[PDB]
Every structure is written in structure tokens, then in C-alpha cells.
Design a protein around this ligand. Sequence first.
Ligand code: C6V
Ligand code: C6V
Lengths: 204, 185
Amino acid sequence: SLTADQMVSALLDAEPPILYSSEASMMGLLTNLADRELVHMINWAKRVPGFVDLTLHDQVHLLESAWLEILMIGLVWRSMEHPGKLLFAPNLLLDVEGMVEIFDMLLATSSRFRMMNLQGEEFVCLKSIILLNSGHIHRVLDKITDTLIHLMAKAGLTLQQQHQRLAQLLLILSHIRHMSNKGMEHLYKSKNVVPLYDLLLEML
Amino acid sequence: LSLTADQMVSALLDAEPPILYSEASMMGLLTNLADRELVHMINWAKRVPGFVDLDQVHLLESAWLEILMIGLVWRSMEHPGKLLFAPNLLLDMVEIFDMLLATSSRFRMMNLQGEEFVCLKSIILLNSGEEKDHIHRVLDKITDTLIHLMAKAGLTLQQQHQRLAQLLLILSHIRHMSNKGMEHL
Ligand SMILES: CC(F)(F)c1cc(F)ccc1-c1sc2cc(O)ccc2c1Oc1ccc(/C=C/C(=O)O)cc1
Ligand SMILES: CC(F)(F)c1cc(F)ccc1-c1sc2cc(O)ccc2c1Oc1ccc(/C=C/C(=O)O)cc1
């Protein structure tokens, strides 16, 4: 029911904080950083319009299917004004076997956003898209498109420039889904970061 | 890049490969089918306005299973519960099979037109990966094509953007389907 300006302001208020923090040392840091970031992500997801109307079962499913893409799109957004480096935290700016191909993708994605001049208002829309897309849900997904296109028209882009930019923005998401799949394959061995159902249920 | 929307949709519709035919028996039949489908794909790709002007090898290395999946998902559309691999090969790993039925159900639920299906395939192929901007400008042209095809259909500007968004968010699903399809292979 929210207006496109009311929506973008709710997403901007929903925004999580920026957190702080050898192969095993670096991994112990990344594992711990994401763990604490997961708790702030569950609070954020409930601040996203429409997600809290959903049954706990649906909320779980979406988060389990999107917790790494959400972490990565947040990462790629922070790291953006730091070319050649990945700002996992303000005290954790980096540049481990197998992890090299994934790091290089996350660098390329960050480099794409910057060249494309990604804005914070479009970013909060995209991260909200990923949460709701991972799995009424299509009614909300339509509302975030209307918000993105409203922000493109408010910025002065022509109707052509609007649908062209929307598409480029929605295709970089195929890459984020890919970066997530390869990451899930790499990390898993066992899991040290608490399954999100235990967390979501623990928080209510 | 000089090409119009109707010139782009018809150029791709012309490039459309033919429909082909057919446990160890099922996988062997599928390996053989796919192996014959890659030769038609490799040739279709050369007919994608922009693609032959390249790097082409890696784009088919990334999109070969996404293209095989979108094709399968497009064929099997009026066959709910079953997957139409070939007219003589209709089957009804289970995870990948279910993920493929859901996509086809979404394709049915959206009334996805063939003219829009060719555009998705060409976007899949190009977005799978001065020479780098060539891919960008072509994708921005397939998007004008998709929006024009919608304009013709009678949809409003708001009903156009939503539908563009709807179809594009399905490519994240087919990227995911391919990735988990690769692990299984
Ligand atoms: C290259 C790389 F580091 F980005 C990268 C490469 C991969 F293969 C996979 C993930 C990544 C990322 S993106 C990211 C964003 C952030 O805000 C914070 C942490 C991380 C993180 O690292 C992680 C993420 C999760 C875990 C969990 C382990 C467990 O359950 O035991 C460990 C390390
Ligand atoms: C369930 C399933 F069959 F869909 C499926 C599950 C997966 F995990 C991965 C892919 C699939 C698909 S999608 C498809 C579409 C088509 O038009 C035709 C064949 C196939 C095919 O099967 C394949 C694809 C490639 C190979 C290669 C083997 C080799 O190099 O030895 C074997 C079987």
C-alpha cells in the first residue's frame, strides 16, 4: 500500500549496521563476521515490507535460500569505492585455497556497480529483490520494480534508459546467485554459522 | 546494433534450432540428445545479432546448460508434471527435475510468448560471462525488443516494466538450476 517514496524510505530505515571483526585466522574472522551479520539480516528482513505478513515457514525458506547473496550484495556495495579490494568490514579490507575465483568474481561485481554508478536507493531495492526472489510475493516484487523505475524517472533517465538500467540491474543478480552457489560449494565440509531457522526462531 | 525490434525478433526467430528426438538407459539417451543439441546451439549463437563479432567459446561454456534448460522448460510448458526432452522422450536429481517443473509452471503462469522466449535465450548467452561494452549495448537492445514486444501485446508502461522484471528474475533461477545441474553431472 506504500508509495514509491514511502517504500524506499522504509528500506533505507531497515538498513543493517556496518560490523567490525593465516588461512584459519582470516576464515575464523569471515565465519564470525557473517554469523553476527546474520542476526542483523533477520531484523532487516522483517523491516522489509511484506516479509512479516508471510508465515514463519516462508520467512525461513527465503532467508535460507538468500543469506549468502544478501551478504555478497552488501559486501560488493561497501567495497565499491575501494577498487582491487573487498571491504568485508572497515577493519577487514582484503585483496586460502579455492576462494580465489570467488573473491575475483566479488571484485568484478563491485567494479560493475561503480562503473554503472549504483545508488544507495537502488541498492536497498535490489537486496530486497534477492530476499523475496530466492524462493503476494509477486505483488511486492512488482512494487519494488515500480519503486526502482520511479527512482530512475526522478533521476532524469529517459523511458528507454529506465527499462535498460532496470534490466542491467536485474541481470547482475544472476551473477550474485552464481557467486552464492560457488561459495556454498566451496565452504561446504561442515557449517559453523548457525542455521537461520535456529536464529529466526530464537529471535521471536 | 543498427537493427530494429521487429528486425531483432524475426532475426532470432529465424535462428531457432530444430526440435530433436531420442537409469544408464535414461542418462545415455539424455547425453546423446544434449550432444546433438550443442551443435545446433553453437550454430544458433552465430546468428545472435552481435555474437559473431568476437570469447564466443567461453560464453557457450557458461550458458550451454542454461540454454538447454530454458529450451526444455519452454517445450515442456503445456506438459505439467512431465518434462519433454524430445517428443519421443517425455519423463515425469529429483531436485533439479522439480526445479525444472516449477520454472515451466511459471512460464505457463506468465503466458510467456515464443517471441519473448528467444530474447531470454539471447540474454542468457550474452550475460553468462571496448569489446566489453559491445555485449552491454546488445543486451540494452534485446531489452528494447522485449519492451516493444510487450508494447505490441497491449500492456501498459507499468505492466511492461513489471513483466520485464518478472522474466529477468527467472534467469537468476535458471542460473541456479544450471549450477546445481553441474554439480550433479
Ligand atoms: C571471497 C569471499 F571471502 F568473499 C567468500 C568466499 C566464499 F567461498 C564464500 C563466502 C565468501 C564471503 S562473502 C561475505 C560477506 C560478508 O559480509 C561477510 C563474510 C563473507 C564471506 O566469507 C564467509 C562467509 C560465510 C562463512 C561461513 C562458514 C561456516 O558456516 O562455517 C565463512 C566465510
Ligand atoms: C534431470 C535432467 F535430465 F534434466 C538434468 C539434470 C542435471 F543435473 C543436469 C542436466 C540435466 C539436463 S537438462 C537437459 C536439456 C536437454 O535439452 C537435453 C538434456 C538435458 C539434461 O541432461 C544431461 C545434460 C548433459 C549431460 C552430459 C553428460 C556427460 O558429459 O557425460 C547429461 C545429461
